[PDB]
Design a protein around this nucleic acid. Structure first.
Ligand SMILES: [Mg+2]
Ligand SMILES: [Mg+2]
Ligand SMILES: [Mg+2]
Ligand SMILES: [Zn+2]
Ligand SMILES: [Zn+2]
Ligand SMILES: [Zn+2]
Lengths: 48, 193, 49, 193, 261, 185
RNA sequence: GUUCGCGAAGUAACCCUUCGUGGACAUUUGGUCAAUUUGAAACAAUACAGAGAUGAUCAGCAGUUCCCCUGCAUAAGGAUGAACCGUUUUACAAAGAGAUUUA
RNA sequence: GGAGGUCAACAUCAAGAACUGUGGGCCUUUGCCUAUAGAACUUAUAACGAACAUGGUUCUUGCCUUUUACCAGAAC
RNA sequence: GUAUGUAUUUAUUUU
């Protein structure tokens, strides 16, 4: 249907960003894949 | 929009809070337009919101410097006189109105009352003849083809005999001291030092 | 249900609090879920009587 | 509208813009009801406009006279160190009062000279310039101050709200991160877990 | 046809008479921003309408019709609309065909041009929920007969049937004597909504009977959406309905699908 | 920025048939009806002369997961309600597939962000007493049938069709799952 | 409605008026928004009490939280703002001793 | 075509005592040297305004229970 | 002498 996208000039007194607000979210930490943690109790617990 | 209770104003209601940021501007743009002692009734250009949100007087006063020191020398003198003359001169009480008294709108009360004349001043038909014609106009010349530029009112262009008469009038209001050598330690630089 | 305090207050019973889809995986569970539902509908359906 | 939108219906602005509580206040309803150094500053500001333009409202009705007009709004611009009390909110503006006392005296003893002790007057210019400048000084500062106040009455205040170190709450910081920076080292001298 | 499709619709109330704004006296002072009253607490305000629509009497042809609007004037659905034939939003009972038009869009929004929310409301309140169709109305506070008990609950029945009957098509009306409610059910989500916004806050019987004079001080009958129905019967019935319906629409998906092959 | 950058997801039906169209872009529009967060709204009238202005009800994060036209709220591909499409796709296969969604508040807000899509998406008076009444068949169907061969009070509890009509002319022409009696006093 | 022009009729003597027609001039507003009960202010009143570190009476700063409130605020207050004060079992083994069962 | 507009948009306004274009020579585009043309506005008791305010950081003070709000000097 | 906190369901959701 084609298109042309024309922003709408405000009415400068009225809010700009009519829907903006200050809220709070917590967010999904989304991943598939893992980060293998890859490295390399007898005499020591004496010491420590 | 003075009466608002309805639903249909819940746009304009928000609109109002918006202009609350812009108001102080309007005050300034109102309060430098004061009609000044001599004018009777002043007419300005307001730019208004179309929600009834606020109304900015829109213009800025432009008055020629000498012509202006004239106009205020006139009123200055007429003052001193009209203080010396009359007997009990009663300063008015403040505030003008008590709090119970919502200010009465313009279209009804005030527009029929007619102005009750200002200062001006006697002047003359002999001394002041050049200047007596226009000197008290709201803005002295919105039009004089040759004398002033034109309606946009910038770059006034005058003539000796007039500018004389102005010199004459403004004599109360003028610095009067023509010898640079007068300010000796009163210049700036002796201040900064 | 005892009202709310802060306007966003959570009612924990209603929905999974923060639902982490456990993982992908190769082993294709997909059957064990039916043993689950059978046991869970079974349990709750018991308690009602 | 701003007020009734904070859900205070028990504060009343009369038509001179005094703010009075009409119902002696439950303490919580005081705390929710303290209002802003802005919104108070700006209340006062409007009060001044309405005061002057009142005196005009009178004159147009024909009730005073163009001389008592001039004296009146003179008296205003000088005694705003009484008629309003804007000096509670920005105290800086107490230069103008000092300034506008002084212009007062000058424009007298070059006026009184040889006539009268009385109230007669009517040179209000140099006041009017001073107050007009000082008003240009707070336009930006208001568009900011109240600009905030309104985005907070819509969008709710800021959710994060960090803060900074400061005079008082220093120690708790210094301590706090001291001990954290032991707990690294002592956590890493232990062999394992 | 000869009824609605024929003569132009009419005013009900003259804008003069239109109701008083500023809801009146729950409390001390009147808040300007919101429209409420300020302080104190008294029992909530609700009241019967002074008004109601008159299904075949006032409905008629209007402006949105000539120019082809969609949603139905709700201040007509209260018969309260003061604009007469001038009103853009349509005045009349939904036929089946208009629903023929809206039904494209009635997923999201009502017959009155309002945007259905998602979650219903604590009480099953006033505007729909797009996650679900519900055609079925709880009706409660039937005491908007005032308190005259009409010698049979089947006079309740005759009366609810008599009122809601007018608006259009109907499935069924199940009164409940155990607990006071009607539970009613219709064809078109359109019609459902329309009856709802119409019949809030009303009183009953003849152009007059008994306390008819004072009918105007009653509370008025709450009309709100209905939840599920716990019995087995109706429930199996439901999954049947859905079932046959999927059974139809598969034909669509094989038509466009099969064509796309 | 990126809010723009996933672009509108829009019906090819409800969008209307015309060749070229104009639609606004308003950067922070409504919140979703669903996730309850801001987004960019696109107005438009379908065609230019139209009476009503389409508005778009949801994110492009939210109308991704479900794959639904932000104005329509049908499926994109099948032109069908959620609670249908994932019902049909529940049928084939056998039992699965519903999307359990979001009461409370930041439950739904939170759950909006993760991109897993969702099950539907995953793939894509003369008293007349006439008895025998079938329970799930409505009045509309009954008096439907009557007006189709040519006013009512039914009781579905007792399966007893009670009935009245205006003139017994409709008595003859009525007669001239049905228990007949032409019953009046 | 203006203007240019044509034709016709009348007035006329190339015009004044009337009729018809051609041409030009002028070219798509507004809506995120319907008008009080059923798509959402918050206080107040009633009752129940009536201020952390302690044995007790107070100054206070912090810290965490999907709690915020007032304030222009990255200031400072809001009981040191409030909530915290609770419920608590498995990386689990090695050696020795007695009872039971069995190849 | 002329006059105007309390009309708009777009350029430009603090610097080697200061701008720009062009011809020619050299280096290798910059850059240097030479020749030439044109320069509105604003500048020497130095500047767009013979006018005159406010804010932030940083130090020095002054009121001095603490913070907003402040006292009076400087730098940015 | 007080801040502070708590509950304030009236209008019958299908067997
Ligand atoms: Mg604190
Ligand atoms: Mg304490
Ligand atoms: Mg604390
Ligand atoms: Zn209407
Ligand atoms: Zn669509
Ligand atoms: Zn969303």
């Amino acid at each position: 249907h084609h298109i042309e996208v024309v922003s709408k000039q405000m009415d400068p007194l009225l809010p700009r960003f009519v829907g903006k607000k200050a809220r709070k979210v917590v967010a999904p930490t989304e991943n598939d894949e893992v980060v293998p943690v890859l490295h390399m109790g007898e005499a020591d617990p004496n010491e420590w | 929009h003075s009466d608002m209770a309805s639903k249909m104003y819940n746009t304009d209601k928000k609109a109002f809070l918006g202009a609350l940021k812009y108001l102080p501007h309007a005050i300034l743009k109102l309060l430098e337009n004061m009609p000044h002692p001599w004018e009777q009734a002043k007419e300005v250009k307001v730019l208004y919101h179309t929600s009834g949100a606020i109304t900015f007087v829109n213009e800025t006063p432009r008055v020629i410097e000498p012509v202006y020191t004239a106009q205020w020398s006139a009123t200055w003198i007429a003052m001193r006189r009209e203080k010396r003359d009359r007997t009990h001169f009663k300063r008015m009480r403040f505030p003008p109105f008590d709090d119970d008294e919502p200010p009465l709108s313009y279209e009804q009360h005030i527009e029929n009352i007619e102005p009750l004349d200002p200062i001006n001043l006697p002047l003359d038909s002999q001394d002041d003849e050049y200047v007596k014609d226009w000197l008290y106009d709201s803005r002295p010349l919105e039009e004089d083809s040759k004398k002033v530029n034109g309606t946009s009112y910038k770059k006034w262009s005058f003539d000796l005999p007039e500018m004389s008469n102005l010199y004459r009038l403004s004599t109360p209001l003028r610095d009067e001291v023509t010898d640079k050598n007068y300010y000796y330690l009163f210049d700036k630089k002796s201040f900064f030092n | 249900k005892p009202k709310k305090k802060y306007g966003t207050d959570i009612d924990y019973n209603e929905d999974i609090v923060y639902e982490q889809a456990p993982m992908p995986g190769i082993y294709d569970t997909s059957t064990e879920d039916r043993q689950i539902k059978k046991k869970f509908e079974q349990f709750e359906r018991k308690v009602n009587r | 509208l701003l007020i009734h939108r904070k859900g205070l219906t028990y504060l009343h602005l009369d038509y001179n813009f005094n703010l009075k509580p009409t119902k002696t206040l439950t303490t919580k309803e005081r705390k929710k009801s303290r209002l802003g150094n802005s919104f108070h500053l700006m209340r006062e500001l409007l009060k001044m406009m309405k005061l002057i333009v009142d005196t005009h409202v009178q004159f147009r009705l024909g009730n005073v006279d163009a001389f008592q007009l001039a004296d009146g709004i003179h008296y205003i611009l000088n005694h705003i160190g009484q008629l309003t009390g804007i000096y509670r909110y920005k105290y800086k503006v107490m230069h103008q009062i000092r300034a506008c006392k002084d212009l007062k005296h000058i424009i007298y003893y070059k006026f009184n000279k040889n006539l009268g002790k009385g109230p007669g007057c009517g040179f209000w210019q140099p006041a009017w310039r001073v107050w007009l400048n000082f008003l240009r000084g707070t336009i930006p500062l208001l568009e900011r101050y109240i600009g905030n106040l309104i985005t907070r009455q819509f969008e709710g205040r800021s959710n994060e709200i960090v803060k900074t170190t400061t005079k008082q709450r220093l120690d708790a910081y210094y301590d706090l991160e001291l001990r954290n920076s032991v707990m690294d080292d002592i956590l890493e001298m232990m062999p394992e877990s | 046809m000869t009824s609605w499709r024929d003569k132009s619709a009419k005013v009900q109330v003259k804008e003069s008479e239109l109701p008083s704004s500023i809801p009146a006296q729950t409390g001390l002072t009147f808040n300007i921003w919101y429209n409420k009253w300020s302080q104190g607490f008294a029992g909530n305000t609700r009241f019967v309408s002074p008004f109601a629509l008159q299904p075949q009497l006032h409905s008629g042809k209007t402006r949105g019709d000539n120019d082809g609007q969609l949603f139905f004037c709700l201040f007509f659905a209260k018969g309260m609309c003061c604009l007469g034939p001038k009103c853009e939003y349509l005045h009349h009972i939904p036929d089946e065909e208009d629903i023929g038009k809206l039904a494209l869009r009635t997923e999201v929004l009502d017959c009155f041009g309002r945007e259905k929310f998602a979650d219903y409301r604590e009480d099953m309140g006033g505007i729909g929920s797009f996650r679900k169709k519900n055609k079925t109305l709880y009706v409660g506070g039937i005491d908007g007969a005032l308190n005259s008990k009409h010698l049979k609950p089947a006079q309740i029945e005759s009366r609810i049937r008599f009122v809601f009957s007018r608006l259009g098509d109907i499935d069924r009306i199940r009164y409940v004597e155990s607990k006071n409610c009607g539970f009613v059910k219709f064809k078109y989500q359109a019609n459902a909504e329309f009856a709802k916004e119409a019949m809030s806050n009303q009183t009953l019987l003849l152009p007059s009977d008994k306390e008819w004079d004072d009918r105007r001080e009653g509370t008025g009958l709450l009309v709100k959406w209905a939840n599920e129905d716990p019995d087995p019967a109706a429930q199996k019935r439901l999954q049947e309905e859905l079932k046959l319906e999927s059974l139809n629409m598969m034909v669509h998906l094989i038509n466009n699908n099969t064509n796309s092959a | 920025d990126e809010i723009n950058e996933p672009p509108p997801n829009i019906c090819e039906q409800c969008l209307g048939d015309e060749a070229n169209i104009r639609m606004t872009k308003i950067p922070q529009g409504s919140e979703c009806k669903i996730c309850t967060l801001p987004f960019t709204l696109y107005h438009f009238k379908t065609s230019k002369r139209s009476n009503n202005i389409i508005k778009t009800l949801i994110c492009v994060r939210c109308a991704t997961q479900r794959n639904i036209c932000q104005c329509c709220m049908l499926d994109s591909r099948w032109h069908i309600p959620i609670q249908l499409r994932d019902h049909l796709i529940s049928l084939v296969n056998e039992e699965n597939v519903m999307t359990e969604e979001a009461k409370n508040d930041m439950m739904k807000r939170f759950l909006s962000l993760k991109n897993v899509k969702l099950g539907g998406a995953q793939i894509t008076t003369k008293s007349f007493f006439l008895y025998n009444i079938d329970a799930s068949i409505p009045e509309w169907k009954i008096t439907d049938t009557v007006s189709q061969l040519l006013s009512l009070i039914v009781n579905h509890k007792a399966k007893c069709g009670g009935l009245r009509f205006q003139s017994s002319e409709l008595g003859e022409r009525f007669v001239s799952i049905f228990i007949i009696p032409w019953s009046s006093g």
